[PDB]
Amino acid sequence: AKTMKKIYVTMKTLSPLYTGEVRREDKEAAQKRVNFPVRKTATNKVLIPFKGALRSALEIMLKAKGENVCDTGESRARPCGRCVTCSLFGSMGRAGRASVDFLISNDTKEQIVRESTHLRIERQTKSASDTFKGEEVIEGATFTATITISNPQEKDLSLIQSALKFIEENGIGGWLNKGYGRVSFEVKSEDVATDRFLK
């Protein structure tokens, strides 16, 4: 195509936020201090997996609408290549038109990440049976990401905004059942030609 769509998304966290650290060496370093370390970059900035959240959100709402969409959440489930989520976020042969960036925190982890603690409490005698120290993100932390749609269709930005609204309602990241991850999105969308860096 001659045009591409840029969606600059901006996340502001209304709820606390948690996404666990993926890296084994950083987990082994942090486990002496914190049992639940947040996902962090090497530049002390918070990484959040964005793709896979948009894909799951669009999978639930496009399945509940009744369109012939596949479910990539099952064990070794292969994307069929024939629905709109397969065209958007990828299939086995054809890749994703929407290259979805990680949510880069605008602030350092020394300013936006706090170590917290939680208790498992026995129900009859009402004392903290277990005390364990986790790590979360403060409210109002700003996460900017860029979604690049290479072969844009008419209903691409509408599906992205619908998945974003579903992510606002249902949360993003971990600990979504106990109240972590309710956020708000700001969207700045534009159409740019691919040859915008030539000459």
Partner: protein, 524 residues
């Protein structure tokens, strides 16, 4: 032709070169003496590892550092046991703060050239025929039968004992002609209480701590507490023990016939982190602790049943070192008596008394001739023709392979000589076709299964069992899921169909499996 670099003098050393194609056996630790030994070894083509004890396995990544080994070969079970042993050995060298011999990159680069193979499967590599057999020291223990052109060498590496519970009590044997034998004398003087462990554990339960080696002995004691009834729980500390116990469970097919569900039962509860070891140290409920991080458990305790080499007790019945008699029985279990029995691996007194008792067995013993494997034609070659400046003859006969003589014999010789589940080949073919269309057996599955079948029959059995094993924690097979409107009962039935079809395929030979699997995987 054979050089005893490491194992000639001491007990902990081993480095046996066989310069046919240079073939190295059992390079291990016991810094410049190690460097001199490695320089004396030189550039070796094949490095063979019998068993995973550093004693006979330590100096393999250093050889990869100095670029002296082209191919490493060894059973799967001792290949991963060697990994495990290399990684701890490395963190033992980093915690003690002494310069190491090799890095973790050397560990990783040592495992790219390592081609595991199971027992009783022969390679024709470098004009040698290398075969592995079992000798019951640990799970991946192999005696190496090297069929050279100038002899037939049998390197028996640390033969086991009749007081073993996980391994076959008679060690396996080369079924042909043996020329030179390389033996051990670790327990070459000391001769000869498995129920006494049960008896003292009964009369003690204050909980009893019992230490051992993390490799070998801990799993034998785990079995001896498993096969009989013990109400008080048995517990694993020292996380080498739990990891080798899990390797024992995954590599179950490399054990006794009676052991081939679980192996060690669910009686043991391992301890993972150090905080549970601290809580177990402060605990007063009676139990059995089998450690190998012993001091946390010991300073509270201070029976301390002490099994090993060194109410403090000593049970000298859980040693995998071979007694004199069963070494003599190993020698008298060969089809032909060997020409020379080289007695490496022991102290001087045990070497002298075993030399005296094999001299009394009238067999020659060295304390560190020509054999010509000839090819006999036996064919009338007077009727010969010239076609393309070649004196060829169209030939019809039989390659007879007897000992010392691969005689070629005609058809008149044949005239004088004349005076596991099992499914059919069409059922196997239609099953593999149906599971290939519904993508359960894929091309990657067939290629990995062909690699595991080239490894050996039991390696393929282990691979297919792990691919078909349902996890009690997730209910996932590790199979590939089908394609279509298939319910869960039918998906389980086709998983069982794939397991039975591939086991049947394991039953077949190494050629009809190849003739089946190129119809679905052209590469393998």
């Amino acid at each position: 032709m054979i050089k005893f670099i490491g194992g000639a003098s001491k007990v902990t050393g081993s480095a046996f070169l066989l310069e046919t194609a240079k073939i190295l056996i059992d390079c291990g630790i016991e810094n410049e003496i190690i460097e001199k030994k490695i320089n004396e070894i030189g550039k070796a083509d094949i490095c063979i590892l019998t068993h995973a004890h550093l004693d006979h396995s330590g100096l393999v990544p250093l050889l990869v550092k100095k670029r002296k080994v082209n191919k490493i070969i060894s059973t799967p079970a001792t290949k991963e046991l060697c990994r495990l042993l290399f990684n701890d050995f490395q963190r033992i060298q980093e915690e003690n703060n002494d310069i190491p011999l090799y890095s973790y990159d050397d560990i990783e680069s040592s495992f790219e050239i390592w081609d595991e193979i199971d027992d009783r499967n022969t390679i024709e590599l470098f004009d040698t025929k290398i075969t592995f057999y079992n000798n019951s020291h640990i799970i991946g223990s192999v005696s190496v039968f090297i069929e050279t052109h100038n002899g037939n060498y049998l390197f028996s590496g640390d033969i086991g004992s009749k007081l073993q519970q996980l391994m076959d009590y008679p060690p396996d044997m080369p079924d042909g002609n043996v020329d030179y034998l390389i033996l051990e004398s670790t327990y070459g003087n000391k001769s000869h209480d498995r129920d006494r462990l049960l008896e003292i554990a009964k009369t003690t339960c204050g909980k009893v701590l019992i230490p051992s080696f993390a490799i070998g002995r801990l799993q034998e004691v785990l079995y001896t507490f498993s096969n009989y009834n013990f109400n008080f729980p048995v517990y694993i500390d020292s996380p080498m023990g739990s990891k080798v116990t899990n390797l024992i469970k995954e590599y179950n097919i490399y054990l006794k016939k009676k052991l081939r569900d679980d192996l060690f039962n669910n009686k043991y509860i391992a301890i993972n982190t150090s905080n549970q070891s601290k809580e177990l140290s402060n605990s007063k409920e009676p139990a059995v602790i089998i450690s190998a991080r012993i001091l946390n458990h010991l300073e509270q305790i201070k029976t301390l049943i002490f099994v090993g080499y060194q109410r403090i007790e000593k049970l000298n019945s859980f040693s995998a070192h071979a007694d004199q008699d069963e070494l003599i029985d190993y020698i008298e279990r060969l089809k032909y008596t060997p020409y020379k029995v080289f007695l490496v691996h022991g102290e001087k007194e045990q070497r002298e008394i075993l030399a005296k008792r094999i001299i009394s067995k009238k067999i020659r013993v060295e304390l560190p001739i020509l054999i010509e494997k000839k090819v006999v034609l036996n064919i009338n070659t007077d009727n010969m023709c010239n076609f393309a400046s070649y004196r060829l003859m169209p030939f019809s006969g039989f390659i007879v392979e007897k000992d010392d003589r691969i005689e070629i014999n005609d058809k008149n010789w044949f005239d004088m000589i004349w005076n596991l589940p099992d499914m059919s080949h069409d059922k196997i073919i239609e099953n593999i076709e149906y599971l290939f269309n519904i993508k359960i057996l894929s091309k990657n599955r067939i290629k990995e299964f062909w690699e595991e079948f080239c490894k050996g029959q039991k390696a393929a059995i282990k691979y297919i069992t792990q691919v078909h094993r349902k996890n009690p924690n997730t209910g996932r097979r590790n199979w590939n899921p089908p394609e279509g409107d298939f319910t869960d009962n039918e998906i389980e039935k086709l998983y069982e169909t794939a397991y039975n079809t591939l086991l049947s395929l394991i039953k077949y030979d190494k050629n009809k499996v190849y003739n089946i699997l190129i119809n679905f995987n052209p590469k393998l």
